[PDB]
Amino acid sequence: GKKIDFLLSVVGFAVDLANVWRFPYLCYKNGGGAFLIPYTLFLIIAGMPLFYMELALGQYNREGAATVWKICPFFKGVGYAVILIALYVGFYYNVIIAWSLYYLFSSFTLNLPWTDCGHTWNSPNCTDPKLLNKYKFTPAAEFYERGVLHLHESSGIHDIGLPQWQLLLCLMVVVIVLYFSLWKGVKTSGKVVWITATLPYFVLFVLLVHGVTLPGASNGINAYLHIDFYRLKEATVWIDAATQIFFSLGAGFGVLIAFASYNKFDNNCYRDALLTSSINCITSFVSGFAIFSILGYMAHEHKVNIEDVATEGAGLVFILYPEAISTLSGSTFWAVVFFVMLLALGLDSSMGGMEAVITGLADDFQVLKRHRKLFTFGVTFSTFLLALFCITKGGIYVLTLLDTFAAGTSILFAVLMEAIGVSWFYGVDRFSNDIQQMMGFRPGLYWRLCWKFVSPAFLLFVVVVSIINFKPLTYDDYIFPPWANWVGWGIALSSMVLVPIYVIYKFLSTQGSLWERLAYGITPENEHHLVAQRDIRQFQLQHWLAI
Ligand SMILES: NC[C@H](O)c1ccc(O)c(O)c1
Numbered sequence: 154g155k156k157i158d159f160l161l162s163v164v165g166f167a168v169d170l171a172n173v174w175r176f177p178y179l180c181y182k183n184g185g186g187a188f189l190i191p192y193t194l195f196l197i198i199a200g201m202p203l204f205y206m207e208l209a210l211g212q213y214n215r216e217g218a219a220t221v222w223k224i225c226p227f228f229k230g231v232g233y234a235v236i237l238i239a240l241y242v243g244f245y246y247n248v249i250i251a252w253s254l255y256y257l258f259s260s261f262t263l264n265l266p267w268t269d270c271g272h273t274w275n276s277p278n279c280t281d282p283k284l285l286n287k288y289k290f291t292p293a294a295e296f297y298e299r300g301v302l303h304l305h306e307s308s309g310i311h312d313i314g315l316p317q318w319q320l321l322l323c324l325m326v327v328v329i330v331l332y333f334s335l336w337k338g339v340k341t342s343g344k345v346v347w348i349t350a351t352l353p354y355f356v357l358f359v360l361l362v363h364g365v366t367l368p369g370a371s372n373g374i375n376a377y378l379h380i381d382f383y384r385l386k387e388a389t390v391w392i393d394a395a396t397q398i399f400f401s402l403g404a405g406f407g408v409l410i411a412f413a414s415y416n417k418f419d420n421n422c423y424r425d426a427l428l429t430s431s432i433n434c435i436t437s438f439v440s441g442f443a444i445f446s447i448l449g450y451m452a453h454e455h456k457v458n459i460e461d462v463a464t465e466g467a468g469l470v471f472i473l474y475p476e477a478i479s480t481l482s483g484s485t486f487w488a489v490v491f492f493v494m495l496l497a498l499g500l501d502s503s504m505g506g507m508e509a510v511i512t513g514l515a516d517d518f519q520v521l522k523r524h525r526k527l528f529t530f531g532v533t534f535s536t537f538l539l540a541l542f543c544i545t546k547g548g549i550y551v552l553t554l555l556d557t558f559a560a561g562t563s564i565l566f567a568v569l570m571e572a573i574g575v576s577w578f579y580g581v582d583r584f585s586n587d588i589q590q591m592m593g594f595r596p597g598l599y600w601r602l603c604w605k606f607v608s609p610a611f612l613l614f615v616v617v618v619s620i621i622n623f624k625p626l627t628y629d630d631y632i633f634p635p636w637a638n639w640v641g642w643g644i645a646l647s648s649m650v651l652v653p654i655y656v657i658y659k660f661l662s663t664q665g666s667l668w669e670r671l672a673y674g675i676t677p678e679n680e681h682h683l684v685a686q687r688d689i690r691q692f693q694l695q696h697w698l699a700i
């Protein structure tokens with residue numbers, strides 16, 4: 154039992170709503186293995202060292218996302234940026250959980266609505282492969298687009314309309330559950346691991362097995378394992394892989410630091426990082442395999458090429474998995490089980506992110522920490538309002554805008570600044586010394602290189618590419634107006650610009666000379682007395698030339 158609980162916790166650390174929802178459609182969008190290659194490369198190189206470093210920071214410093222930067226005061230802005238990114242991701246994750254809850258509620262029937270046309274939400278163009286000899290006219294696609302989102306009542310992001318009442322109710326229920334599971338403390342979140350630890354793996358395994366034995370799975374798998382290098386030479390796949398890695402691992406949102414703040418001082422962070430990375434890789438590959446097999450079956454069914462079977466945007470899982478479920482025996486049971494699993498994963502992810510935000514904003518201000526209930530209610534209410542903003546008829550457009558812009562370049566810049574700060578300024582040698590004090594062994598040379606040189610360089614390259622090589626936002630066959638792209642870049646800057654603003658604020662807040670001000674702002678807050686002694690490591694070339 155003791156071993157089982159430990160393994161379950163370790164695996165649950167890894168599996169997320171991202172790995173189940175976001176990875177499928179991202180892998181579909183960039184072809185397939187052309188995405189896995191850069192996905193695994195970035196996973197190792199950036200994700201593993203960064204995951205380990207965030208865990209180590211959170212475990213050693215015993216502070217939230219924002220306050221942990223007492224080691225280097227200037228990067229409290231980076232802390233606030235990651236908090237804001239967590240806020241936005243919370244908005245649209247809650248919206249997606251509302252989708253899943255509605256879909257589960259609708260799944261409680263003997264005749265699943267995603268089996269054939271002929272319902273009140275069915276357009277005259279609906280085509281049923283069974284009732285008769287594009288992708289917007291398939292049964293499940295029609296249901297998802299019309300009977301849930303009601304997208305047929307919006308012309309674009311400029312005519313979003315008014316909130317859908319069913320999704321509004323479901324989002325309200327999800328938000329209420331979140332608040333009631335977050336209003337007491339971190340303890341109540343530790344008893345939900347079991348449901349999210351076994352159901353996702355069982356569902357992935359059963360879906361893999363069933364999909365492999367499908368009429369059209371062979372072509373899907375062949376396309377999945379076929380790699381296009383001309384796509385690898387475009388940097389869009391690289392951008393997507395990097396953002397997906399930092400979304401699936403949880404790094405860069407302040408979740409890891411906030412979680413590790415409550416971990417024991419003798420926990421083994423390196424082992425956790427290794428196991429989580431391996432599990433993430435295996436689960437992502439299995440999800441890609443199953444998804445491509447299922448959509449190859451769909452292509453063989455609808456008589457369309459694999460390149461246009463389903464939408465490339467958010468909701469590919471909600472359009473695809475029901476199709477596979479309809480082919481199973483006793484499809485109602487599998488549908489309810491799978492959507493319960495999705496609900497559990499989404500609730501766990503939202504709980505983690507909201508707890509990260511709450512801890513980060515509470516460790517900074519003691520008065521907020523003394524009123525956790527009211528603070529949780531306020532944050533949850535703001536999240537509910539801004540998610541309601543995304544429940545409108547054309548809510549998919551706002552959701553896509555947020556998904557593309559809240560994360561991505563913003564998270565890449567935040568993680569790059571975290572790495573540069575920690576390693577270069579705080580001393581990689583000092584960080585390894587803290588690791589040794591905590592766990593009992595200094596990290597290997599590979600970890601030190603990854604933290605100091607390899608990861609910051611790759612992240613800088615990705616950020617520069619993302620800024621220069623940027624394409625206008627689109628959703629399938631709809632092209633967003635330019636002002637939508639302007640608003641997206643404004644959202645990205647709203648969290649990317651918190652670093653220089655805080656840097657200058659701290660510079661103009663402290664008193665003293667220019668050199669004294671820089672020393673005061675670089676030195677850890679608990680070693681400020683050394684500033685008057687003119688003994689600063691950062692002003693000696695040896696500190697910079699330490700590997
Ligand atoms: N945008 C890529 C497109 O959806 C696609 C998916 C899978 C493929 O095998 C392919 O050739 C193209």
Ligand SMILES: NC[C@H](O)c1ccc(O)c(O)c1
Pocket residue numbers: 169171238239240241242243244246247400401402403406408502503504505506507
């Ligand atoms: N992978 C999801 C990530 O852990 C996350 C960050 C911020 C959030 O508000 C959230 O719901 C999830």
